[PDB]
Symmetry: C4
Subunit: 287 residues, 4 copies
Amino acid sequence: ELTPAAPVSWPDGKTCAVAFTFDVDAESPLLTTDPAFADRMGTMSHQAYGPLVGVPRLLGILDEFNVPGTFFVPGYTAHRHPEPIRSIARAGHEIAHHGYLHESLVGADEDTERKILTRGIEALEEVAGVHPVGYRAPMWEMNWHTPKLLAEFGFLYDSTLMDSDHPYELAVGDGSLVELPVSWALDDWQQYCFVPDFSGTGLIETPAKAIELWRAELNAMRDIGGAWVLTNHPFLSGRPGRAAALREFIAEVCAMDDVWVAGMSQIAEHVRAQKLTPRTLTRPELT
Amino acid sequence: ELTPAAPVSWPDGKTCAVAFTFDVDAESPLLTTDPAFADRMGTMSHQAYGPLVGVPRLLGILDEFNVPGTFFVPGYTAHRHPEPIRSIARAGHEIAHHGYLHESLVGADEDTERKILTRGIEALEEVAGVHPVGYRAPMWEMNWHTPKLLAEFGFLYDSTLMDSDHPYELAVGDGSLVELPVSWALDDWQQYCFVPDFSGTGLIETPAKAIELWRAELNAMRDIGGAWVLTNHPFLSGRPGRAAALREFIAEVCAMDDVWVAGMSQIAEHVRAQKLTPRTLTRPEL
Amino acid sequence: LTPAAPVSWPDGKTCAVAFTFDVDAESPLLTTDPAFADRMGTMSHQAYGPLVGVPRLLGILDEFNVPGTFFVPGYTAHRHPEPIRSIARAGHEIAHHGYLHESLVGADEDTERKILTRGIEALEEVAGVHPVGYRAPMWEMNWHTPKLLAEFGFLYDSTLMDSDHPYELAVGDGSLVELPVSWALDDWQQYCFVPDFSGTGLIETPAKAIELWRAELNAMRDIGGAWVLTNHPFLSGRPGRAAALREFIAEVCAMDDVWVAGMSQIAEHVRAQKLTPRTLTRPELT
Amino acid sequence: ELTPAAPVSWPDGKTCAVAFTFDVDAESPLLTTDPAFADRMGTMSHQAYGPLVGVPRLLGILDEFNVPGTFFVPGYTAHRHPEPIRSIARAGHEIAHHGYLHESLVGADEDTERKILTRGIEALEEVAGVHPVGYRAPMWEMNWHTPKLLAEFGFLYDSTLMDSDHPYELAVGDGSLVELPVSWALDDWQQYCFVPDFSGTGLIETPAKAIELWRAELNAMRDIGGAWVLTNHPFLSGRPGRAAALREFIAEVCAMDDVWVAGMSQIAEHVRAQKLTPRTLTRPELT
Ligand SMILES: [Cl-]
Ligand SMILES: [Cl-]
Ligand SMILES: [Cl-]
Ligand SMILES: [Cl-]
Ligand SMILES: [Zn+2]
Ligand SMILES: [Zn+2]
Ligand SMILES: [Zn+2]
Ligand SMILES: [Zn+2]
């Protein structure tokens, strides 16, 4: 009988936790899908906007409001854009693992996954001297064998699963891994992404519509007392109008006295110190 | 030949019937489409949210306003999430049939469909102690022979067809079957669903826009006097922002003096008592 | 290739409005794939058009004494004769829309002729009417189609999108009025969701669809064109959509600069102006 | 070491540049994808609306507010619609290059691309007596070798790339070429286009929603100080409702004292006079 995740107690009289997170995907989701995307200068320029413009713009916004940010960086982004990635670490923001070439884990065996985890840790170490304690699977998809590899690599937390509003201890072998759950609604990819021959049907929402959608989710989460995890991509949300609406929303959230605006590893550490009973879903069985 | 469905008289001065229905699809629509979806821990975690989080949240909302909900539960959902499905029965809400592994009926022969009906019935009996009197076809698609299978199985009603605003008696020979019609617009799936490689192009509507769409339909349905059947999925509408907007909408509907907020079997028994002349569409001939 | 000039409107009017309806029902699906006939759920959704949408929309047109033009595939007429007859008894024009709503992509002149005759014969035999108007199914036709239409003595075509103003299509020895349309003045892109056939799942609120048509209309009033709206009873006939359309019709009826007319009446006004015929020609390559 | 583009200084104390641009695509994007689109009288009539109706409607609106516009004209459009294209030159607006038959550059070698540049220039010269100094790649996609071709053909600027909010000088060796960057958000195609069997899913936005999107972007660009380049297609934005909404947006923009509303060559010459250090992205390397 799988228990649903229960509410966690938050610190400092706070009753909701909020994390602003950024997946610095840049070119990597396209290159892993089809390496011939490398030849598309137009498309590669749209992707390069994230690390080149979006990353400094978003860091200026986080710094204006003294907000911790968590940047999930694919190792290949770090190798192709080391000055943008180092600027994140230099600004004092946490960097977390997001694969090497943002590889799909669908069909991946344990050995393939283990090589990608090493390759991403080494790139982030080389480029920015960071050893990530956090992970998010590219494309928010992972295998039933993935958490044990994350445990083997000593990761503090994962932020990939969507079966809860509350953080929890994901049971892994004879231990656990903190889970900081996400949702497709709390992602700018479905709001702004348009990349011909790759992603998006042509629908490009207004920045007000996107904030509206997140604000309705946040107000509800404040009543639930969960961990509200927002995911944005610098090549999308770093654009002028979207960044300007995220800045206004961030100002609004920092003004909420009931909310703990925090880094992902700080959230995960606070959860870990609660010594919760681990839980996990199991693979669906079919006769 | 074929007549349109005529309005039914609602009980005790009510002039519109409203039914809040929930399809506890969870993993099953993906698993029948491709069993390899079982390997996707992420997608499976998104689908498990429905029974784990969506179902208690929605029960809490239905409870706050004393609203009856009808929960269409595939047999597989009941077998994989027995506690949430048992929680629905214990709360006093109706459980109705929705296949076993939410199978598509497209191309299913009568025997294939009978075997699925049996399998779903046995699952809901086993897990929840329920024998459903209501049926909704997975993916809202059935065969010209399905109504006669449902009648043969003793179902009170079907809630799959969309040729009417008014409930009616579906012509099935010597048997009897009430039809409680639905429509694609009164479904949250086209408003909120996004599951890569399965369904959804990326469009995720705000909760206010989905309520706005449903309220325009409900206010117009109140002038028509039909049966307004809303279908939500717990893994979609159970999300915080969406359930909060649903909650407010349900309060609003409870304040409509003219509307009868009822369970699906209560609506179907009222329709059955009117003794309507049966009717049916027939397969197009080419 | 000269652009179409503004046409003079009668007496004090400076702009024409035509409310049109394509009673497509089952036919676009059945021609795309005959196996759609086995889909009872989908077949019930398309049947709503003739069964429910047509009397609702006829009722609204009656309340505001608005003439409507109904483009009816011959198949819809044979499958739904009473809904089609009911249009003609209400005094509204019935126009040609193929037989089984066939795509004209890749058809030779003989295939298009046979279809033209089949549709005329169905509308004559079912409703005792003879169409003077034509609109290609899927709004697509061949460069050889205007000549075929002129040969069948049609008064007008309503398919082309190269002008805001009606015009005389060059067809040699014959005559043929074009009353142009546009994708923005279609409800299909606003409301259509049929699994395995049309829509990505996007379903717009009725207010959004009216806001979009109203933007166009208000601009067309300054241009002096012919604003031709296209709606499908299986879509716009739904409670919420029909209600917002009714309020929109009430609003258009209070615009004294606007001529709200039937399509053959607009076409006969245009024909009386004795315009110089024009036509686009097939783009030639290298 | 790639540096992001720096802000440029604008004239007359302005702090933002704005360009109204139009791609007179007409029939050409469809005819290059599949020549059988020529048989489709309905679809061809929809495309012919751009040059027959949209071009004189948009020229009337530009004339009303004394706004320069830049029209990117495929050479095929000039040949099929010479009078609408000539009317653009007569009204004094700039005409720029957009291929011949709006050809995709995906898989194009430099010879195929040079032959298209020549075909396009000769069609524009023969039709409207104009020699284009501007270029935009059909489908906003080009090869890593395209900028050098543009410099060698004597082009002043390109407006295809998306790695910057600011104009910059592209690294093209001994030659020179201004980049006037663009964005998918500042395009009407994603907002209004529905062409069966070619482009669009059925989503057709209201004109107020498109304008809302572009104004959120423009307001944020005014604080950034870049060049906000709008792209519209007469066959889409020339429609009564869309043109009327564009007309009122242009009136609002002419009322902004901080904005420089200009032609693309006017903006590019002002950039070129600043003598910026050339920069360029490089092809992603994959091991
Ligand atoms: Cl990025
Ligand atoms: Cl569910
Ligand atoms: Cl219809
Ligand atoms: Cl155009
Ligand atoms: Zn990612
Ligand atoms: Zn279902
Ligand atoms: Zn049609
Ligand atoms: Zn173009």
